[PDB]
Amino acid sequence: GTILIDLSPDDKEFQSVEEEMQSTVREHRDGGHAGGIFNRYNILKIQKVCNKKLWERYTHRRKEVSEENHNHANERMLFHGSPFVNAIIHKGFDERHAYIGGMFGAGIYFAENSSKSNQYVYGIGGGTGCPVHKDRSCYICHRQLLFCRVTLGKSFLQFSA
Amino acid sequence: MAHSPPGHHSVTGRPSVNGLALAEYVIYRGEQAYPEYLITYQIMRPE
Numbered sequence A: 001g002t003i004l005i006d007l008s009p010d011d012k013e014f015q016s017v018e019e020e021m022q023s024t025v026r027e028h029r030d031g032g033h034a035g036g037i038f039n040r041y042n043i044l045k046i047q048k049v050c051n052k053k054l055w056e057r058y059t060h061r062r063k064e065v066s067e068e069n070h071n072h073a074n075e076r077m078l079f080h081g082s083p084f085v086n087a088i089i090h091k092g093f094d095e096r097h098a099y100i101g102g103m104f105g106a107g108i109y110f111a112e113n114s115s116k117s118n119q120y121v122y123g124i125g126g127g128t129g130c131p132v133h134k135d136r137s138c139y140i141c142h143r144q145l146l147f148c149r150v151t152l153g154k155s156f157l158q159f160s161a
Numbered sequence B: 001m002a003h004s005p006p007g008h009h010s011v012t013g014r015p016s017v018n019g020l021a022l023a024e025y026v027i028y029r030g031e032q033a034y035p036e037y038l039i040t041y042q043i044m045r046p047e
């Protein structure tokens, strides 16, 4: 039930997502090992992901959270990078997309820094890099990230290194 | 998948060392996220 609609580079929505993408690139403590060496991206395409069933599943949970938390869903737009991006866009997030070894427990992880999610695009630790050149820093091959809507509700604050 | 801490709906990982790192977040239910944009890109070799 998923369809993908291309945004034009002329569209303000293309431009604002490109800007979140470009402006939240940071350097990473691995020197670019997981995700590659870059300061910016060549954005080739931005598509809106439309799936009614998945959307309603999201908004239902959002309301339950809100009502347990003085009417505050505490919703954010966050990046997600995953080898399972094709399954996620078609079937939604579930336990199969969880980071079992994540530092805050087996759950599904999102990032404010696009460059952080870029590290997971080819797998945890960047896997073996791109399918074609086996290069975690490939400048030729095309990559995909998700920019996602996330409900945090009452978030347990964990201070951490 | 684990559970949220009792009385909470997610975990926020507040960066407490790398001054430039933004926050990271964890949910324990797939239903608390929707994948709104698919961005196709290349990283660019610095000049």
Ligand SMILES: Cc1ccc(-c2cc(=O)c3ccccc3o2)cc1
Binding pocket: A079, A080, A081, A082, A083, A097, A098, A099, A100, A109, A110, A111, A116, A117, A118, A120, A124, B024, B025
């Ligand atoms: C199997 C698996 C494991 C982890 C991710 C993932 C994807 C993310 O975008 C991410 C962002 C911040 C911190 C951790 C993150 O982990 C994606 C897939």
Ligand SMILES: [Zn+2]
Binding pocket: A130, A131, A132, A133, A134, A135, A138, A139, A140, A141
């Ligand atoms: Zn490649």
